[PDB]
Amino acid sequence: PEGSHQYELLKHAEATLGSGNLRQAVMLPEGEDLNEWIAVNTVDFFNQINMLYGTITEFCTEASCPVMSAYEYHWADGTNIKKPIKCSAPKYIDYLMTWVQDQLDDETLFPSKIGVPFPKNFMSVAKTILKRLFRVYAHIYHQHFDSVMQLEEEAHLNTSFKHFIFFVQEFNLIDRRELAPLQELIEKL
Ligand SMILES: [Zn+2]
């Protein structure tokens, strides 16, 4: 969001949330690009998750999270580690969050300059990003839930999560197989 027309699309997605009808405020506004919309909300979801998890970092440590889990996850990003290897959740989130940032920082995928079409493979990249972000949601719901309830960050995470699930559901960016944890939750909302 160079502060340009995406910034508006961002302030779009944010402001329209006040309706309280999430199944609507997440749809493509009339005559807007799908890839652009997905890109903008993908970024805001990245920032929201990064900040939210940032609150509980002290409660998520190498001791507190021997593994990323509820369901276990091992970081094989891609190119850099082809063989999935287990590690601590703090290491895992650090790993993936940097990876998601690099996705957002690569103009082949997320261009700043307008008029440049998104890559043809895009929305495979976006779908991947959002599944990995959902895992961060999952860690925070399963193990540190009270660590928030006690903290001041509580209804923020459920609001952002409800936004997340409603959005990805509208656009089919996350497989139901990946929503297996919290499945009890995508049902409530
Ligand atoms: Zn943890």
UniProtKB/Swiss-Prot annotation:
Protein keywords: Acetylation, Metal-binding, Phosphoprotein, Zinc
Q: Which residues of the sequence carry a binding annotation for Zn(2+)?
A: C60, C65, H139, H144
| UniProt-listed GO biological process terms | hippo signaling
Q: How is it modified after translation?
A: Phosphorylated by STK3/MST2 and STK4/MST1 and this phosphorylation enhances its binding to LATS1.
Under Gene Ontology molecular function, one entry of this record is: protein kinase activator activity
Function per UniProt: Activator of LATS1/2 in the Hippo signaling pathway which plays a pivotal role in organ size control and tumor suppression by restricting proliferation and promoting apoptosis. The core of this pathway is composed of a kinase cascade wherein STK3/MST2 and STK4/MST1, in complex with its regulatory protein SAV1, phosphorylates and activates LATS1/2 in complex with its regulatory protein MOB1, which in turn phosphorylates and inactivates YAP1 oncoprotein and WWTR1/TAZ.
Family to which this protein belongs: Belongs to the MOB1/phocein family.
Stated name of the protein: MOB kinase activator 1A
Please give the organism. Homo sapiens
